[PDB]
Every structure is written in C-alpha cells, then in structure tokens.
Amino acid sequence: PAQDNSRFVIRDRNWHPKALTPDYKTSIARSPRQALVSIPQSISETTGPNFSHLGFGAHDHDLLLNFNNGGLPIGERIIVAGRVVDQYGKPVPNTLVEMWQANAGGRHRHKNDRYLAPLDPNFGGVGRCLTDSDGYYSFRTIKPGPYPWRNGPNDWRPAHIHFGISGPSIATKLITQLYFEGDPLIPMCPIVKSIANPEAVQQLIAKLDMNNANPMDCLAYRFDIVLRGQRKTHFENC
Amino acid sequence: PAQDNSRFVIRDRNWHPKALTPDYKTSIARSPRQALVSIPQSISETTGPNFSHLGFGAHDHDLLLNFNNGGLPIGERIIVAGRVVDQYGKPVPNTLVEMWQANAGGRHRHKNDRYLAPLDPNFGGVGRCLTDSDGYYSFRTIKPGPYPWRNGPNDWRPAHIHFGISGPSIATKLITQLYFEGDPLIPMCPIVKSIANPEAVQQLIAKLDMNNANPMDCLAYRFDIVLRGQRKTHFENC
Amino acid sequence: PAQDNSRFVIRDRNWHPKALTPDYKTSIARSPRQALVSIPQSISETTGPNFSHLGFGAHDHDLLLNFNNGGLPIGERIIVAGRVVDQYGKPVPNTLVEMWQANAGGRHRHKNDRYLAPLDPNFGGVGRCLTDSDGYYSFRTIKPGPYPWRNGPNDWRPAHIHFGISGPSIATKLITQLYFEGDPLIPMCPIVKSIANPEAVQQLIAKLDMNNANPMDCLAYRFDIVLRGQRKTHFENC
Amino acid sequence: PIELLPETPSQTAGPYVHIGLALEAAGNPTRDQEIWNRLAKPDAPGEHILLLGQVYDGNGHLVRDSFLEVWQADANGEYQDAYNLENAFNSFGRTATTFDAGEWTLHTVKPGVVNNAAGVPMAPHINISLFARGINIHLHTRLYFDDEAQANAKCPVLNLIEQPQRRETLIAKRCEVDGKTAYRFDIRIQGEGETVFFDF
Amino acid sequence: PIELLPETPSQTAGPYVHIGLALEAAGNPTRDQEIWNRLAKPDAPGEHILLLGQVYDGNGHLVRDSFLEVWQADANGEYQDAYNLENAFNSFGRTATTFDAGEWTLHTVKPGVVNNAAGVPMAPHINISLFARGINIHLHTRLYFDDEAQANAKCPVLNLIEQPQRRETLIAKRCEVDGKTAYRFDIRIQGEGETVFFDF
Amino acid sequence: PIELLPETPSQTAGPYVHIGLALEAAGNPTRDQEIWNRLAKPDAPGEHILLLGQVYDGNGHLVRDSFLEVWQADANGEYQDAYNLENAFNSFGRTATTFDAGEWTLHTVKPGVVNNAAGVPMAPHINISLFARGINIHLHTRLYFDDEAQANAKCPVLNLIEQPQRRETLIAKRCEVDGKTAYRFDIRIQGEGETVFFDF
Amino acid sequence: PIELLPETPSQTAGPYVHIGLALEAAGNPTRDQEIWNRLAKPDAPGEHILLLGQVYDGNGHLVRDSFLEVWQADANGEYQDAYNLENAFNSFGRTATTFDAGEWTLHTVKPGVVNNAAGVPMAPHINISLFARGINIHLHTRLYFDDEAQANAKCPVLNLIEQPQRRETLIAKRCEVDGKTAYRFDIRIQGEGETVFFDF
Ligand SMILES: [Fe+3]
Ligand SMILES: [Fe+3]
Ligand SMILES: [Fe+3]
Ligand SMILES: [Fe+3]
16 A cells, blocks of 8 residues: 655646636636645545556557557657656656557547547557556657647647656646647647746757667657655644 | 740759769769750750540559559658749649659569568559649659668668659659658668768758648648749840 | 677767768778678677786886986976766776877987887887776876878878777777877867867866876876776667 | 656647557557456456546536546455456556447456555545547546445545535436446546545 | 948758759659749740750769759740749749759740840840759859850850850750750860859 | 867878888888788688789879778688787778889788678678878778679669769779789779769 | 647727728727628628617616627628628628617628538628627627527537527517518627627
C-alpha cells in the first residue's frame, strides 16, 4: 500500500489555461461558473498508481510498427523523445507516458473523424511507454498533419500529438499537447491561445533535435515535460 | 516569328547563389573556374518560346488527381498559388510554370531515390500550368516531407517544391525552389546557404495564406516569383 | 574486443577551421580539393584505444621534472588543469591527454627549430596523462613563449601548448592548441584566424585560475575540452 | 521570491481522447493489456458495487466524449498503487461515456476509510478526474455515498465546503441496476446543481 | 541609385529534375503533350542534323543527371516562338543525359543566320542552357558548327572571347551517326578545355 | 533547434608534432612506454605484413613532417581496445614520415572482416588519420588491399564512393621487401590522383 | 503569414438607427423611395405570408429599438438581387420593432428551395441580420418554417447544430392573422431559449 510522506507544489492556475476561454467555443458550456474549493493534501491526493508491472508489448512506443498491415506509414519519420522531471529538476522514473495523434494528413483513426484526408492502412496513432530510471522516454512515429475543425469558420489545429503523463501521484497527472517548432499555425490556434502567458506556450513546442536524428533515416524532436515538484512533509500537526 | 524590341535587366550574380559553394559538395566539380564571358543582348537572348498552344490536360495543375489510382494522396492538402511579375512589378501573363516534389514522407517517384520512406500509390509529383492574364498561377498538392541526402553526414533537405518558370524570354527562364514558412530545416541547409544574402533566402519562403484556404478542406501558401524586368530599347546604334 | 553500442554527434565543419585557409601559407598545398566523402558510423569509427593499462612514468604529467639534468627549468611555473567532457556535458574518464610545447623562450627541443632563443637544459617539453574518474587532467609546466615563423614576413605564434585528446573513439580523437588569457598575439595569428567564428576561438583560451594556484609557488590556468557527444544507438534497422 | 521550473501547461484531452486512452471505445482493436473499468475482480474482498453516471454541460445536455480516471482505497482502506491486471483489486481505473454509451459505469468495491494528514477519518470516497473536449485542465471531484450519512456528516473535506446544498452534489444515490447494488453519480459541470470541484 | 524588385534567386535543378521536366527519362508515364527533343519533324525545311554530346565535370567524369534547353532559329533564320507540337519546326526543345543515356541527342535542322542588335550577322548557333545538381544557376552557352568556318571567323559573339583557343570550345565537330549527318558538342564544365559560358 | 555544448575546435599539429608524439623520430630520448609502429609482436596470429607509403602535397612534393595513427581489427575481425605493450597484437599504432625517413612504415597483420551497422561485411581495411603542419583538422582515410578484389567489390563503404577511379586511391598495391609480404599505400592530399577522405 | 488590409470594425447601430434607416418608424418624413417591409407586391407568385415576432433581451424584456434586414429567395428558389421598387418581388427588405410597435412584421412569400455549395438542398429559410443598441456587431440567424418538417430534418445547415433543442429556436410556428397565413418567429438574444446565431 502507498504511504502519505509527500506534498506537491500548488498549481499555478494562471500559468495553466483557465476553464472559460471563449474563443475555444466548447469551453463555454463546459466550464464551472462556481470556484474550485481548495483542499489540504491527504493520502487520497498524494498517492497514485505505479505502472511498472503493466505488460507492455514490444512495439508500444513504435508507431511505425504497432498497427502494421504489411507496411510502413506514409509521412515524416520522426523520433520524439525527452525527459520527465519535477519542478525541482528531479527526474521522474518509471512513469506512464501515453500519446495519440492524427496521421500525416490530419485524419484520426476514430469514427467521429469525418475529414476528407484518407486513413493510412499502416497507421494507428497510439503509443505508450514507461520512462527509464533517468526519466527518459521515447517514441517513433510520423509527424501529424494539421486539420480543420468546427470552431470558427477557417480554424485549423497546428500539427500536434497528445500526451498523457501520470507521474508519482494523481495530484501530478497531466494531459497536454506537444506542438512542433516553427508551425505558423501555432499563434493562431484558439486552443493554444487558451494559455494566456507566451512563455507557457513555449513550453509546448517540441524543438528539432539534430543530435538525436538517425542519419539517412529519421529526424528527431525533443519534448521535456516538467510535473509538480514533489517535497518531503516538514513541521506538520507540529 | 519573334522580334528584338526588348532588353532585360542584367542579373545580380551576388544576389543569386555563386557557382562554387563548397558546403554543397557536388558543386565543387560542377562549377566553372574561368569567368563567364559577357555578351550584349541580341534576338537570340531576348526571345523565348510562348506555350499558349500547348495542350494541357484537365488536372495538370492538380497533383491530388493527376496520377490517381483510385484514390487520394496521403498528407497535408495544400493549394500553392501566387503571381509571376517582372522586376518593375508588371505581371507576366501566359507563362509556363512547372513544378515537381517528393511525397508526404520525402520519397520522389524516380529510380534513383533509394530512401526508405514509401511511395504513395496515388501520388506522382509533377504539375504545370500557364499563368493567367494577371500573372496568377495555382496548384493543389500535398506538402512534401523533408528528406535526407548524402552531402554531409546528417544533412536533411527542408520541405520544398521545385519550380521552373519560362517567362518572356530565354534570358528570363529560371529554376528555383520554394520552401515553407517557419521550417527549422531552412537555415541549416547548405543548398539554401548557397544564397549568401538572407534577404534573398526570404524570397523563397512561401508564406501561409489563410484567406486563400478552403475551410474544412485545405490550407494554402502563397509564392510570388519575380523575373528580370523587361524594358523597351532606347537610343540604340544611336 | 570492443562493441558498437555508440553513436557520436556529427562534427560541425563550419565550427572547426576549414582545410583551405590561405593566410596560413602551408595549408594551400596541404588541403583536399575534392569533397570529403560522408560515411555512416560503424564499429570501425565508433571504438578506439583505451590507455588504462599503458604505464605512465611518475613524472610524465610534470614538465618541471621529467626532463631534469639536475635543475629546474627557467620561466613562469604554471599548473595547467581542466576537465574533459562530451557535448552532453558527461565527463570522459580515463582518456589520454598528451601535450607538447616550446620553453620560456619560444625554442622547441627539435632538430628543425633553428630559432636563436636557447634551449633550456632542464626542459624537455612533453607530458601525458590520463584523465580521472571525473574527467580531470593536470600538468605542471612553464609558460611557453611566442616564437616567429616563416609564414608572412613578421609573424609570431602566440604562446601555446599543443594537446592531443583520444576520447572513446577515433571519431572523438582531436589535436588542438591551448592559448593564454589576454595574449595580444592571439587575434593576429593566421593559425588562430583559420577558425572563423570567434566564439570558437574563445574556447581555446585558457583562463588564469587563481583558486587553483599554489601560493608562493605557481599560477594556474584552466582549460576544459569538449569532445563529440556520445549517445546510445536507438531505432537502428528498426 | 524563490521560482521553481514551471509546470508544463495542461491542454484539453480533445474529442479523440479515446484513441489513446480508451481503445475499445474509439472502436479500435485493443492491446493484450488495457487500463479499464473493472477495479475489482469477483473474488476481491469488500462489498461489490457498480457505479454509473452521466455528465452534463451548462445547457443541460450530455457530454458524450468524457473520460474519467478514478482512484480509491480498497475495502480495508488502503491504496493499492502497484497496478497489475492479475491483482484481484486495483485502486485505479478508467471509464468513459460514448455516443453509444451516454453513461459511464465502473465495477468496483465500496472503499474503506482513510485518515487525512491531521489523523481525522474521511467518509468513504472515490477520487475522480474528469477530461473532455472544452475542458482545458481536468476537473477534480469526490464521489461520496448516501448511505454513509454519519461518516459524511463529520468528514473533514465535505465540511470545507461552506454551503450545505453544495455538499449534496458530491453524494452518489444508492439504486439498483439489474438487481445488483449501484450508486449514481451524475456530474453537472456548470449551472444549477453544479458539482463541487476541487483544487489541491 | 534606383533599386527594382529583386529577381527570385536561382536554386539547383537537383538530381530529380527529370520527374518534372523530362518525364519519360525519370522512367515515368508521360502526358499526351511533352516538350522534348525533336525540333523538326521529317517534312520540315533546312538541312536535318542530329546533335549529341556528353557532359563532363572537373574530374573528367560524366555528368549523368543533366538537363538541357535549347533555342534556335529555323533554316531561314527566324525564331519560331509559338510552341506547338503540330508545327513542323519548334525553335525550342529539351533533352537530357541519363544513367542509361551518358549522352543527350537532339533532332533538329541547322539554323539559319540572324543579326545582332547592331545589324552584324552572327554565325549559325544553337543557344543552350544547362541544368543539373551541383549547378546553382544554370549555364549559358552557344553551340557553333565547324564547317561554317568563315561565318565563325567574323561572328561578333565569338570575337568577344579574348583568347582564340577558347573560341574553339564552342565549336561542335561534324561527324556521322548511323550515316546521318551529326555534330558533336561536348561540354566541359570545369577544367582543361572548359567550355566558355555566357552572361547576358 | 536543440543546441549542445560545441566540440573544442581543431588546430594543426604543427612541425613539432614529433616531440609530443614520435619521440624517437624527433631524436629525443624515449620513455619506458611508447605508442608506435609495431602492432604485431612476431608471434601473433594472421598474416604478417609490412605497410609503407609516402604522402604528397598538391605540388607533388613529399610531406616529411607528417603523423599517422591507425586502427584496425585483428586477424579475426576483432578490434582490441585495451592498449597494452605486452599483448601480441594491439589495434592502434602510430607512425610518421621524417627528413631522414621520407617514407613511413608499420608492422602489423592483415585485418580480418568486420560488419557494418546493417550487418553487411566490409572488406578488410585499416583506418588511417593523418595530421601534419598545414592540415587544420586531421584527415580520415581507409586502407584497403589489392589482393582482396572480391570483398572490395562488395564493400558498403567503398561503394558509397560515386566514381570507380576514386575507389582506386584507397587500394594499397602488394609488393615484397626482403622476402616479407608488404603493401605500399601512398597518400596524395591534393590534386591529380587525390586520395579519398571521409567524414563521419 | 499573408496579412490583408483589415475590415473596418463594426459599431452598434444605436438608439437612433431608425432615423437613417426606418424613417417612418422614427416618425420623420420619408423620401420618394424607401427599403422596407413589403417584399411581395400582392400579385407576386408563391404562397403569401405575413412574418412577425418579438425580440427579447436576457432579462426577458422586449427590445423595442431593434432593426432587421432580411434576404431570401423567391418562390422558385431564386435570389433576386436587382433591388427595384417596381418588381413584384424583392429578396431584401428591412423591418423594425418600435416603442409603439413592440412587434415587427414583414409581408412576403414563402421562399423556395436552394442548394448549398456541395449541391445539397437546404430547407426553405430566410436569412436575418439583427442590429440594435447594445449589439456591437450584428447577429445573423435564419428563419425556418414549422410546416416544412421534412426538409428541415435534412437541412445541411440546421444539421451543423449539435444539439436538437437548439435547432428548434430557428423554427417559426405557423398561425393566422385576419384570415392570412402568418408565422411567428421570436428572437431571444440571451438566456433561456437563446436563438442560435451563425458565423460565416
Ligand atoms: Fe487533436
Ligand atoms: Fe529536391
Ligand atoms: Fe607550436
Ligand atoms: Fe450616435
């Protein structure tokens, strides 16, 4: 069983996007109008599952091969890798990292995607992996294409991949999106603009990583995710 | 038959790339060591074919359909359009514009391309079109992927499409390459760096054009090409 | 036997000196006119000698004493020390560092040095050492003086000491020269000026390190060396 | 003041969350091992319950693309953190509501009691995180049980909510689905009867 | 001084130039109408010739990925600028050298004579533009004929080249291929015997 | 993009490279232990050979202040990394051309076969790095054997070179010197016949 | 990206919108020619109808200083663009709610069917633009008919609205006023029952 020996740095809700960001339409009816109630951290919040024993398949992190129907996906081969650390800079080992995305052309393999771009018969779109002892993770995939959506009349999502990260506790779990360095769609996307401070937008742009690329094969991008800092409890109930 | 009534502005060979740019390897054995001899312009240089009567097929400018093998190419649907003008800003009507490129993943449909990324069964890679009365041209295609090549050890070409443009005379014909706005591969490519002045590099970056995009369908980029200015002859042989 | 588990970051041939640098006269006939052929890294390029069992004398890093004809060399007694890391900032333990330099006068103990500054009978000019578990190396020596050379009619090399560093492979082996903080000859030498970016030059300048000096005995300089980055192989032949 | 590295910012989970987190549900083939809605296997200790709810938006309409993560103590009141598809009890699970399923369901045992940091017991509760399109950062809530009125009346977390009618929104209603004991927890995101959401 | 808009910069045509300009040659299916190497059809007026050459680099090796565009007057010395695949003569054509073909060939008639801007006649010449990988901006040259020595000796363009041995490089050599009259124009890009290149 | 710390820039070894690195060839006393030109003690496995060559500059003059380091597999295709002066065989060694010795030599064994990163065998080669005054960053080459013609035609490395003639410059011609099997391998730095140099 | 000149920004029409645009309803003398609420002269083709409605604010109070412009196809599904006061039918017209007339009206004909950009028929609708004090940029809506239930279920436009209840706010309820066929279409700007407004 898990022990309450930890506390997590309180979230900066001005750094993160707000609930109501009206330019992102769906958020109008999907956000609480009352205030969040603040609660002290107990063992219900500071513990969270550990996924070390989860049975991972050999290509779980390898989107070029995990779906495969006698073939290779079409599109830019890329490795996306990085490191998971907390706010104090400590690595976060054996953490679950999940990701999903569209194909090269912007189509998602899901019933609700009605978009004209076709499905790629050799591409699924999901991956998972556990971070190593040093907090490193990595996947290989194809760079997604941008896509249109019904928000405003000619709104287009920039290329991105979605990410989920568990971390040490349920207080640390996060879902986010990586974007790619230099995409002129970035500054225009209302979901991206839901983040008020531009330095926070920056933290989501995965940067081109030539030192990690495989010469004559695939490019690489680096994306480092930082989770709430974890500290030991001190002076509590005196 | 064509008449000698025109002169063309002399080329700025410092604006254009030089012949010998050693970081681009092949250029070492492919460039003249003697100087270009300078010749006055005669009718041999100031006339050039007109392609108005060339028999264009219906999808010649439409790379989403011109190859087609019961299908749609995979990758970012884009319209690339622009205008052809001379250095004085005059439009260049009924000009031949040709282009070619790789597929979404960086593979060229040509025997010499040994690259691991696969061929897309619904994609060819060539297009042509004649500019309208106002100098406008346009095509529709998929955004090419970047690709590796044997120059240096981990050199990658940025996404581009090649362009040829005839113009009014053989003195105006040009072959160039369009790159896409914000591609972090641009500043690193030795072929791009063969152009010494950064303002000349800029003239090759096709910019994201949201006003020209088809909502819920395809994005657009704009690329305007400027050919040598054409003037009427004045005070010649007195 | 050695195993091919590593890959080395590609060198930047725009940061290092070019092979042809005309002011450095001797490079004109000693440089390839053809382009370097890139090859993929294999076990032949990724392994290298390990000098852990070579048997160093007790005084091989000590130039004040390793030549000794019952006397101390004349000149500024200095300790030169530093650390060898890779481009990821990882120390490089147990590597061989070798160095050679002239005497306090600019004379080298070699038959071709016909310079009028005399030999110092207690000074040889060579050392070698192995870095430690943490990447540290160290020497005791006398500050070399500048000497003239037959390049331009009044050229003088700044004081320098030569270093050869093996690293983990032959892909990392490197020969460089360390220069001394504020020597006004540095910006004037064609051999230094063969390095085009001045920041790259800045990395060759050893800094006076008072924290490491021995009071009443000898000054110290600090020189750290950065060897090509080493990473594990990932996603190779899938 | 002292600044740490800032936290990567949250982004909505979007309409396609199921493709990476609820595979069956996006109507896609699964992997050998998935994190899903059965927290307890039939031979696990405690009282077996079935939970279900529906998710509402501000206009009183169903939210059919939501995805929920839950965290709970077992029956003797301990957090089983080592996830394993062989264990009889996992404290963690995941469920979703789909265009097909307007409703989520979770097969678990009623949790035991745990103390807060100060040593005071809390009433039985499931911790819940909610994600969906239009939600930029996920929401935190607690599901409590209606037949645990005495423990609920003294819980030091429920008491942090100022207004009493607001504490009610957190209380799942005992009911019966296929004659098997169940609790209904409906979530109202916004509006009249908005569910309380937390921050910690 | 007065500045006009600057000219889009040139970029190499690259190794894959054939995919967009010499379709057959990239070994790809063609379109109904292509700009190729037959400038004259068998019933066109003038003397029919066949030209061919090879392209060399600085090391004496063949350039097998080159692409050439040519422009020439017909037999009565007029530039037919209206391109049409039905005309008996087009003044423009295009040819390439391939890994298969180390050599380019062009089926045309010997051109007539044209005057320069000053009224002085030029010797018969084909105008040539060359493109290939490693060439950043294309090269300009003129192909002259060796059996037109008198006209060549007075051409006001050949005379602009200072050194006489350099004028030679521009002179195609009369020969016979399949017993049909031919001229050989080899191009040396760099080195010993470098072909003269122009700027205008 | 992602930027790493820069590598320390290279500098020429200079004319006095010998004093730090070929103590004998500078005519200075040696130390107990030196890295030199004897890779193979005479009782090591494999076929014993003697290598020699000359190094020319672009004017065809001898470079007599040059320094060479070598790396090669033993006779079984294994790279022996632990350098030790007591092993029968070491995979590293150093050699030099002097004002006296215009020629360099090395005593070793023909290397057996190694595979490349894709598992494809390369032909027997010795890796060579060449440093001298006038060379700002050392030059990498490979020495291959003329009696290995077949393995040489299939080599993934020798086949990365476009031009067949340029492959010939990495090929050492077999000879004999005092009844002992020898290969001559001359290096031309620049010019007619330039040896091929590599980047990796 | 590519940047165009900006559109001039919108501003509220304000309380006195009537004086520039509903001269009669401001109680000011008119001009010979006014754009008004009679689209159909009584002898035009199609089914003649009377439209009316009220406009509420978010507090449920009547908006009595409001101005409406309309655009609709004739009875054959054709948009008549040349405005002329002599045509039997015009596709444009204007109407207003006053301190006196809390209600607006329009005399016209039920519009026939038009296709959308993909060739798919939309159900009969009238496009409405609503301006008043307190509205910074006018609001676009569409008026559809309750007796056209089938065409309404297949409309590509009414089907772009996610929630079925919200489609009902664009539906005008058929009634009769003095023996003449009438539809009531009320607009709720804000709040309970808010009419749907569009962007295009
Ligand atoms: Fe998405
Ligand atoms: Fe290309
Ligand atoms: Fe020196
Ligand atoms: Fe006003």
